[PDB]
Every structure is written in structure tokens, then in C-alpha cells.
Coordinates of C-alpha atoms in Angstrom, one line a residue:
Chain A
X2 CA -29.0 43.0 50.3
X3 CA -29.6 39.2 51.4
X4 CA -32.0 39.0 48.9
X5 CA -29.7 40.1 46.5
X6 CA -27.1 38.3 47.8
X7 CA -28.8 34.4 47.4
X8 CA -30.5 35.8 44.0
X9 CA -26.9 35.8 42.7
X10 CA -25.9 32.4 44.5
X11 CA -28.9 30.2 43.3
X12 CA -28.0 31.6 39.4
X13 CA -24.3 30.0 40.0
X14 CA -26.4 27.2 41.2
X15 CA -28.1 25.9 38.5
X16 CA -25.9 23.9 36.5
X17 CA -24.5 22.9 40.1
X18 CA -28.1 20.8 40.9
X19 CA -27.0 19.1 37.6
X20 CA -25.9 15.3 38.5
X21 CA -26.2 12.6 36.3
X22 CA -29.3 11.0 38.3
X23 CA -29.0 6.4 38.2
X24 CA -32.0 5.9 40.6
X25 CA -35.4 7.7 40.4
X26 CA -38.2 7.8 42.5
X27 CA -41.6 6.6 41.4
X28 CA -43.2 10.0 41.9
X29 CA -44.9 10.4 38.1
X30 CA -43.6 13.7 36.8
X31 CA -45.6 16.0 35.6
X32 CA -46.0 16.5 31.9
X33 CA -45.6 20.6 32.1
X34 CA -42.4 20.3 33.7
X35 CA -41.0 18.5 30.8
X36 CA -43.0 20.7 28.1
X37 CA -41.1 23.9 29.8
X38 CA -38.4 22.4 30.0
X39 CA -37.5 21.4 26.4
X40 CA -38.7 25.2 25.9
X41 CA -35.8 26.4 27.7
X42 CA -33.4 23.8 26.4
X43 CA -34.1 25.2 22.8
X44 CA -32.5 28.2 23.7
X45 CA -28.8 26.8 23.4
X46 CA -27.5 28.0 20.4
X47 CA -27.3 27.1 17.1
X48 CA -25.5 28.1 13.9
X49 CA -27.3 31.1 12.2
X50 CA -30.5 29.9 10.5
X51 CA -30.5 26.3 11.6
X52 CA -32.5 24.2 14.0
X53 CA -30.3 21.0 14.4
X54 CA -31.9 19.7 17.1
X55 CA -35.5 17.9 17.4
X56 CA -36.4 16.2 21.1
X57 CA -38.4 13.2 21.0
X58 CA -40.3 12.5 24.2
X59 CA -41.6 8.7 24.1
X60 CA -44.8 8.7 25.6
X61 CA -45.9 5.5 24.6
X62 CA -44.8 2.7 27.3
X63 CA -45.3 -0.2 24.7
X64 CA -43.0 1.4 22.3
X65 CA -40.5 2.7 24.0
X66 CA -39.8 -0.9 25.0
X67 CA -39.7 -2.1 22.1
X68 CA -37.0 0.1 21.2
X69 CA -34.7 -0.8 24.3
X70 CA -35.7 -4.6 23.6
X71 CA -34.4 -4.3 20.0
X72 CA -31.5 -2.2 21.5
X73 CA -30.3 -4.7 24.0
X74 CA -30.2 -7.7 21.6
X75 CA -28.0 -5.9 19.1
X76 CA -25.7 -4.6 21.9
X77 CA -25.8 -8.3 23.5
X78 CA -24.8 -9.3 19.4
X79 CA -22.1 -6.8 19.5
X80 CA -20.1 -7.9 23.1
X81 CA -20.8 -11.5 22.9
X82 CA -19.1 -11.1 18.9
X83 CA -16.1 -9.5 20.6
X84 CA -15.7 -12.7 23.0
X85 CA -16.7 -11.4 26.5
X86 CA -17.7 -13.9 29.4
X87 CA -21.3 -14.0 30.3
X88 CA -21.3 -12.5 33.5
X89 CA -19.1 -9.3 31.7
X90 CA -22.0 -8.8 29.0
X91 CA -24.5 -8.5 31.5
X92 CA -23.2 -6.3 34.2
X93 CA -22.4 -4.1 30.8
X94 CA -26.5 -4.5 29.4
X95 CA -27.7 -3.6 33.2
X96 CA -26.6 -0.1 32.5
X97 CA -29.6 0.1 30.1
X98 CA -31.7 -0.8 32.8
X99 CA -32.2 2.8 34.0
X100 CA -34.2 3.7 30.3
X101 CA -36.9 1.3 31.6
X102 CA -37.2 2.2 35.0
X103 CA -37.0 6.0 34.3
X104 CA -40.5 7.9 34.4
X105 CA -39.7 9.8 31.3
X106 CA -37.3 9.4 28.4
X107 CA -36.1 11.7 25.9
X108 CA -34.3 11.0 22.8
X109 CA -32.4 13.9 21.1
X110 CA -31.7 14.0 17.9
X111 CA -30.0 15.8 15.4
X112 CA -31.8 16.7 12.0
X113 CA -30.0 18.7 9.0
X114 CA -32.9 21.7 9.2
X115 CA -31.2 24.6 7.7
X116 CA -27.8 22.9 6.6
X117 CA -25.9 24.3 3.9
X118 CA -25.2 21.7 1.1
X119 CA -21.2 21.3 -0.2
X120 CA -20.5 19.2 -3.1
X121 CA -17.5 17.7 -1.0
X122 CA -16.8 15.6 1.7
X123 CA -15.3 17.4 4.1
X124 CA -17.4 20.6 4.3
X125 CA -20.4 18.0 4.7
X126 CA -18.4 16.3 7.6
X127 CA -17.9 19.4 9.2
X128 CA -21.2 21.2 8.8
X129 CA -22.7 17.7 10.4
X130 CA -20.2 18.0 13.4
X131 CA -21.3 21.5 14.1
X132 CA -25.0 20.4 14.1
X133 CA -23.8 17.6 16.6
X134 CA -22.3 20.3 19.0
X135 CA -25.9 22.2 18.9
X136 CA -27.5 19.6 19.7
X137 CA -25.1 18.7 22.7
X138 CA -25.5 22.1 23.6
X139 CA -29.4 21.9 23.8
X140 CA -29.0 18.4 25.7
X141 CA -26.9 19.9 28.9
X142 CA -29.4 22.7 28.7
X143 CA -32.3 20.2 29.1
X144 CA -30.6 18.1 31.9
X145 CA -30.1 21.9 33.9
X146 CA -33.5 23.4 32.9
X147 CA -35.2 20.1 34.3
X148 CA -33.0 19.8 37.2
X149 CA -33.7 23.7 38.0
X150 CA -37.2 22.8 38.2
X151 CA -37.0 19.8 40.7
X152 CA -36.0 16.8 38.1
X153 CA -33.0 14.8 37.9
X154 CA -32.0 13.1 35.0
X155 CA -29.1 11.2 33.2
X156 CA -27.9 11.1 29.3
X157 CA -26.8 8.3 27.9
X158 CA -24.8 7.5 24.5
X159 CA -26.6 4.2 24.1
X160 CA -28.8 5.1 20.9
X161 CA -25.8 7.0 19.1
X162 CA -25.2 2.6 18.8
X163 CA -28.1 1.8 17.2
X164 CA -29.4 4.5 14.9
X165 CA -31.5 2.2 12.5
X166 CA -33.0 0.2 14.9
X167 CA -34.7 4.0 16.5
X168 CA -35.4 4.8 13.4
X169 CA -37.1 2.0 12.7
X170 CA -38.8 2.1 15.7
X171 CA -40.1 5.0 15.5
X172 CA -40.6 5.4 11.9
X173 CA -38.3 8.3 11.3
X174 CA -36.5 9.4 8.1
X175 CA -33.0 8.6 7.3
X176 CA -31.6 11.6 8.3
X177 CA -32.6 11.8 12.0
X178 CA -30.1 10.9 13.9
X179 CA -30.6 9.7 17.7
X180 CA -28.0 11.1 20.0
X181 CA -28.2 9.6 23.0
X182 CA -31.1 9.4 25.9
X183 CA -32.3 11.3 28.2
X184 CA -34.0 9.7 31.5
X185 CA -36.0 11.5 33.8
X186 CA -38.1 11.8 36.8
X187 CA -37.4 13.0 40.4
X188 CA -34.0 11.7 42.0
X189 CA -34.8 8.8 44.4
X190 CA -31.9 9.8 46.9
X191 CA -31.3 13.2 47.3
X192 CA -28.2 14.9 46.4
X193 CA -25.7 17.6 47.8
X194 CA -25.1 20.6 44.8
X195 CA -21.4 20.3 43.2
X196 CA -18.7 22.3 44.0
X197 CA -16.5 22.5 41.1
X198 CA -12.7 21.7 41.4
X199 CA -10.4 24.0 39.1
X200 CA -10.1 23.2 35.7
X201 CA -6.2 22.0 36.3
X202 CA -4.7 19.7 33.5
X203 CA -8.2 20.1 31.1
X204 CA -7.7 23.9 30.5
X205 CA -4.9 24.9 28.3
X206 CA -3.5 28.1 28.2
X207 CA -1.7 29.2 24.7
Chain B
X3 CA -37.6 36.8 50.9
X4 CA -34.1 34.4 50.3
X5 CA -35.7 31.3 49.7
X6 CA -37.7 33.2 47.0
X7 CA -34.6 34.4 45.5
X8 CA -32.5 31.4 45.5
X9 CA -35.8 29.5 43.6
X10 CA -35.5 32.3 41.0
X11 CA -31.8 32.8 40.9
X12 CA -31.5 29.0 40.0
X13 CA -34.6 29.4 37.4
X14 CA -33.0 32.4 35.9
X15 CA -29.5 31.1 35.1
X16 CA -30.2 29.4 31.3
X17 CA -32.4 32.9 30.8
X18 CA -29.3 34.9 31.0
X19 CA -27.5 33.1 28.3
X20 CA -26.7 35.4 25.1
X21 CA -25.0 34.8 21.3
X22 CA -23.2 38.1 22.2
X23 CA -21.6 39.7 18.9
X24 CA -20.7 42.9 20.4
X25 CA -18.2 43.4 23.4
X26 CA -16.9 46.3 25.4
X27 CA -13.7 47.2 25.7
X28 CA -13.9 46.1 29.8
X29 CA -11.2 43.5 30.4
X30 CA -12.8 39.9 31.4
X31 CA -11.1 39.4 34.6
X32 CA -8.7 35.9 34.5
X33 CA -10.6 34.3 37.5
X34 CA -13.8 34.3 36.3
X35 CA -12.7 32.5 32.9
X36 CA -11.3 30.0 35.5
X37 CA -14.5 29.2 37.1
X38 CA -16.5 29.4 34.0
X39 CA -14.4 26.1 33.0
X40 CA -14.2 24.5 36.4
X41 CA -18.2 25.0 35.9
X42 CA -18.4 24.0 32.6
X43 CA -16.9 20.7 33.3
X44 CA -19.6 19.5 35.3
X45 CA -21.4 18.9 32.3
X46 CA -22.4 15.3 31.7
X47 CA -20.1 12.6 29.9
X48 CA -19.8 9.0 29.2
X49 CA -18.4 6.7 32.4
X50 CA -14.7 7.5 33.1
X51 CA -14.0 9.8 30.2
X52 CA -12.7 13.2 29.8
X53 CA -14.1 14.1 26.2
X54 CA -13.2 17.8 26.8
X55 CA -10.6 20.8 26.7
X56 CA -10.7 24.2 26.7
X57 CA -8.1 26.2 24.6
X58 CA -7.9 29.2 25.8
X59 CA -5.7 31.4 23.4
X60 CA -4.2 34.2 25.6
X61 CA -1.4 34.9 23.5
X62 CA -3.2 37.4 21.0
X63 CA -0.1 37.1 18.4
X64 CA -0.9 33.2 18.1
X65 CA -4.9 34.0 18.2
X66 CA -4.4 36.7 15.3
X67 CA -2.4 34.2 13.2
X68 CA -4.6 31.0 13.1
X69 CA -7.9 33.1 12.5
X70 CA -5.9 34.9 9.8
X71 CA -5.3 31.3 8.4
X72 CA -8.7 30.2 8.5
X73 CA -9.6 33.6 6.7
X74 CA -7.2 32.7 4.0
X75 CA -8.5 29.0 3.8
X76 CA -12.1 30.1 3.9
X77 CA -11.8 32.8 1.0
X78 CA -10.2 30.3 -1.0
X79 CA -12.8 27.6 -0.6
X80 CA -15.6 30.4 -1.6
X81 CA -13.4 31.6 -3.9
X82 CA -13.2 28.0 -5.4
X83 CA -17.3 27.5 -5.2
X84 CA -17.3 30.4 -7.1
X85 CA -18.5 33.2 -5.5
X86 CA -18.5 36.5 -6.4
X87 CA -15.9 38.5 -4.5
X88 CA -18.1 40.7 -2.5
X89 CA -20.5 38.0 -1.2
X90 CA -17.2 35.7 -0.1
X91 CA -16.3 39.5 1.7
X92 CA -19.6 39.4 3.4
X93 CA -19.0 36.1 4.4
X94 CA -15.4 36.3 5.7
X95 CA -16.8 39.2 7.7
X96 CA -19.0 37.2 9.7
X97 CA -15.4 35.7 11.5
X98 CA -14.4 39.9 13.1
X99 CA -16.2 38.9 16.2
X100 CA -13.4 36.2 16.5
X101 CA -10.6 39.2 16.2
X102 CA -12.2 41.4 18.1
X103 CA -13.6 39.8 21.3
X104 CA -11.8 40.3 24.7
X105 CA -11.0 36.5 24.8
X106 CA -11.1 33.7 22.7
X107 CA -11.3 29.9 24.4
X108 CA -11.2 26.8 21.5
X109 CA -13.7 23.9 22.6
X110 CA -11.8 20.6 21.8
X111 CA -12.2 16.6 21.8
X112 CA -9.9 14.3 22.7
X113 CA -10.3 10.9 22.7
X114 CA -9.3 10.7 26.5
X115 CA -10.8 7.1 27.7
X116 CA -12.7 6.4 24.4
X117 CA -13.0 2.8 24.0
X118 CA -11.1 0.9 21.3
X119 CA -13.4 -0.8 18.9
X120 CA -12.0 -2.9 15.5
X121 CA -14.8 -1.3 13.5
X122 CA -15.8 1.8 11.6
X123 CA -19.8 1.5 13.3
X124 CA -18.7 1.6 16.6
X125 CA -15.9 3.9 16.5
X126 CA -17.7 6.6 14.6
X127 CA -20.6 6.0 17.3
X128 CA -18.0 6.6 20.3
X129 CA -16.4 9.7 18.2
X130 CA -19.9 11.1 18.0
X131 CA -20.9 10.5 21.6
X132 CA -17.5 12.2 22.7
X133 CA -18.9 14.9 20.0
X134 CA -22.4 15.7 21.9
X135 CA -20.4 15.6 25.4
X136 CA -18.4 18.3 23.8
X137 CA -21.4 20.5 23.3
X138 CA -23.1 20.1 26.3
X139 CA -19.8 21.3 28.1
X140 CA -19.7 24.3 25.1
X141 CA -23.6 24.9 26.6
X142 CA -22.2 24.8 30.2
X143 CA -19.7 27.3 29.5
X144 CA -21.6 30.0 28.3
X145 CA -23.5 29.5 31.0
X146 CA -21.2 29.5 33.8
X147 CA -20.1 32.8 32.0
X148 CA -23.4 34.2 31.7
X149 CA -24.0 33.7 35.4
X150 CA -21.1 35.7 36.0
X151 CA -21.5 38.7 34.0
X152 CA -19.8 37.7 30.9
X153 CA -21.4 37.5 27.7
X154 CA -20.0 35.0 25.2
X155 CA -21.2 33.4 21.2
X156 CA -20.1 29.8 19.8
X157 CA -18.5 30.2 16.3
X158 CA -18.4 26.7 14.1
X159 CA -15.7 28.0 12.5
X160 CA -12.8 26.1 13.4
X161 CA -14.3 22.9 12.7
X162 CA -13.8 23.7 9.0
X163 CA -10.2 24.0 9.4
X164 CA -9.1 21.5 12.3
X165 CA -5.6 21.0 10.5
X166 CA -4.8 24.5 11.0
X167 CA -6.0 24.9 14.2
X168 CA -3.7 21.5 15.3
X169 CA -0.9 23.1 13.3
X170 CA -1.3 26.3 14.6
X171 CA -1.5 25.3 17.8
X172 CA 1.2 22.1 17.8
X173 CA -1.4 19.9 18.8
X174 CA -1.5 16.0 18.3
X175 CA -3.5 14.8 15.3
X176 CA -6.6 13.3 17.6
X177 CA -7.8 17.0 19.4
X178 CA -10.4 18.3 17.2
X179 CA -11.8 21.7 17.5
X180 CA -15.4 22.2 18.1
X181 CA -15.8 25.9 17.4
X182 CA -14.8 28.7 19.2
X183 CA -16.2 31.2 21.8
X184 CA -15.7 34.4 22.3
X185 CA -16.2 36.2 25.6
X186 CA -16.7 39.4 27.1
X187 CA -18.9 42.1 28.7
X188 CA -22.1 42.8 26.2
X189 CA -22.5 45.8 25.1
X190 CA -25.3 46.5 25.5
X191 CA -27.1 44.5 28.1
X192 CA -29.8 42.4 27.9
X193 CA -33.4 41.1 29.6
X194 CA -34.3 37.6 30.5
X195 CA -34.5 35.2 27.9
X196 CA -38.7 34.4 27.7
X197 CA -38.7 30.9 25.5
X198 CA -41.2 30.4 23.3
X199 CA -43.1 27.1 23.6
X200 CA -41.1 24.1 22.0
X201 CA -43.9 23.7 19.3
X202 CA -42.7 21.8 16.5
X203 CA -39.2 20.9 18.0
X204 CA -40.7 18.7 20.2
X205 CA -41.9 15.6 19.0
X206 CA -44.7 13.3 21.1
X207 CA -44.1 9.4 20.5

């Protein structure tokens, strides 16, 4: 029965070892681990007959800092255009410093494999957002099903700013779209699981 | 032997998670919804945002009317594309697991802490981040759910008529629906998920 008992406890675990990891150890992370665990991530679901989301692991040191070079200088373009003070722009670019640093990065993206074809607008929008939600859905289940196997990790919007540039990069066609970044490699500090507070003022009852 | 089962416990959760179309008539108990959510909030988004609410439509008067107005918008549309009537049928038909299911909780964004940018680029870029935030708490919910018994299936649906849902619903113009899930105990139950290797899904850079 006390088997039982923390069989049940460590499945309403899982998404609980989840944190949003800033600081990782240098431990290298083994390849497998990430293989498995972009296996289980493709098991979020997706509209019938789609496959929205592709994962695009960035192996190659030299190119992946490329890309955050190229990356930084446009976002560095973008803040200084808007008229912040030095000291503002960087404290705001050091938040990109965790892509370099972390072991492993992951870009998601979101390709239009299986999506129906409207002649208007808005069908097209919405069809595209529904893709985006897949793909979202397949993101948290890559942060758990790495974090369930030992490995923190940490998305990040910062690519959704700069889709060309990765596409460039990486010589992709025009209709994959980066959404965000996912860092990884074993947490440097160690971290208690969550404990959820209720829902309160962001569940709505109707 | 607990050390054991707290690895696999943890290693099982994701493995649970089902697109459940068919639901028994067991009532979902309240609490359990509750803690779903609570769960499904710890999913990831940007710094000091709250991208995310869940609708859930309790009222099954309300619930009956806005699918019954999607229904009519989304016959008309097919209607329009030309369709003949029986494949628009078949089509419309796919939306009874909506009706039917034991609960019904809308997935919505709201622009709560998005940053205010001048231009289209960066606004569409925030909108779309706040999107995929969305989804990973959508992910998160089924599987809070599916850790605690409850089957559940994301519909699209509602994205295709977000005016209808907002009127529907009285809400603002800037909470967008995401889809809808539907939630109950399976049917029939189900073994662990087994994935299949990521093959051409994941791509090497």
C-alpha cells in the first residue's frame, strides 16, 4: 500500500519538478536524455491529421552563436530605437545570456504540416493560432518530460522576435516559424517541487 | 520499494495523457477541476505575465447556447465553401463531444502584463508568445487531469468563432479563446502511452 501510495504522489509530481531553470550546472547532458525526451513531448496533442510542431536541437556550438549574436544586435537595434539608457538595454540583453551558457538548446517551431487551406483571412489566422497552441502544448511537455528525467530547463520568447534572422541562420523555409527557446542541462542549484496555490482570480466560473 | 515508485510515478505522468472522445456518465468531482488548474498554472510564461484563464462553463444552458452558435456559424461557412450537405453534417458532427462531455473549461489569453510596443512586428511577436504560453498551460492541464483520473481532448474550435465566444460569454474584446477541453472519466480506459522515437520531428542542427 506504500508503494502504491508514492506511485500515485510522484505522478502528481511531475509537472511539479517543472521550474523555469536560470543557472545550470556544467555537468554535459547526455544526448539520450534529450532524444527521449522530445519523444515524449510529441505526444501533446494536435489537431486531427496535423503535425505543427518540429524541434530543432542546435548541436553545432559555432552556429548556435551565430544566431544569438545576430539576435542580440537586432534586439540591441530595437531598445536603443525606442530611446532606453545604456545601462537599461543591457541589464534587458543579459537575459539572453542563459542561451549561451546553457548545455543544450532547443528551438520549437511551428510548421503548417497537415493545415487545411481557406481562401480567406480569417480561417487562415485561426487555423495558424491553433497550430501555435500545439506547439505550446508540446513545449510544456518537453520542459516536464526533461525535468522528469533529471533536467531543468527554461523557455524563452526571444526568437518569436527575430524569425528571419533563425531562418536565415539556419537555412529554413519561409514557413517555419521559431517559437521561442528551450535551454537545458542539469539545474546548478537545486530546487524544492511546487506546491500549487488555488487558481483564485485566473479561473472563471460561468 | 517507494523510491522506485516515486521515480516511476513521476516518469509515468505525460504517459497517462489521452485525446479522450468518449466519457462516462460519472460526475467529475468539482475539486479535482480545481487542482487540475491550480496545476496547470505552473506552466511556464514570460517574466511577470499572466497570459492565461480558464473558462470553465458550469452553467450548461450558457455552454449549450454558444456551441449551438458556433454550429450555426460553422455550417454556414461550409455551407458557403460549398459543400455538399452531408459532408458539412459529417463535419459539424465532429463538435458532439463538446455537448456531450461532463465538463467543458475554455482556454483563453489575455494580454495581462504584455508589453506595449508602437509596432505591428513586435506586438504580433508578444501576442504570439502569450499564444504558445497558452498552450503549454492547455498541455499542463490535461495533464494535471490525467494524473488525477480524468480524461480530457483539446478542441480548436472556438478559435474560429472568438466573437461569439466573447459575446456569448460578455467578455472584453482582448480574451481570446484558444480551444476548448472537454473533461471526464474515459470510457474505456487506457494503457501507458509508449512514444515512438521522435524520427523526423526532430531536427539536428
Amino acid at each position: 500500500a506504500m508503494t502504491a501510495e508514492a506511485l500515485e504522489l510522484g505522478r502528481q509530481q511531475a509537472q511539479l519538478l517543472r521550474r523555469s531553470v536560470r543557472r545550470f550546472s556544467t555537468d554535459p547532458v547526455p544526448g539520450d536524455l534529450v532524444e527521449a525526451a522530445v519523444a515524449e513531448a510529441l505526444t501533446a496533442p494536435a489537431p486531427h491529421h496535423t503535425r505543427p510542431t518540429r524541434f530543432v536541437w542546435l548541436q553545432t556550438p559555432a552556429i548556435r552563436a551565430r544566431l544569438l549574436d545576430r539576435m542580440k544586435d537586432k534586439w540591441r537595434s530595437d531598445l536603443t530605437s525606442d530611446g532606453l539608457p545604456a545601462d537599461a538595454i543591457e541589464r534587458r540583453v543579459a537575459r539572453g545570456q542563459i542561451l549561451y551558457d546553457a548545455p543544450e538548446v532547443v528551438i520549437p517551431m511551428l510548421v503548417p504540416d497537415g493545415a487545411h487551406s481557406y481562401p480567406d483571412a480569417a480561417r487562415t489566422d485561426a487555423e495558424h493560432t491553433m497550430f501555435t497552441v500545439a506547439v505550446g502544448a508540446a513545449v510544456q511537455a518537453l520542459l516536464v518530460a526533461l525535468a522528469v528525467r533529471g533536467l531543468g530547463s527554461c523557455w524563452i520568447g526571444s526568437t518569436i522576435f527575430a524569425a528571419d534572422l533563425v531562418r536565415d541562420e539556419l537555412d529554413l523555409p519561409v514557413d517555419w516559424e521559431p517559437l521561442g527557446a528551450i535551454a537545458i542541462g542539469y539545474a546548478d542549484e537545486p530546487s524544492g517541487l511546487r506546491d500549487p496555490v488555488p487558481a483564485a482570480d485566473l479561473l472563471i466560473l460561468k
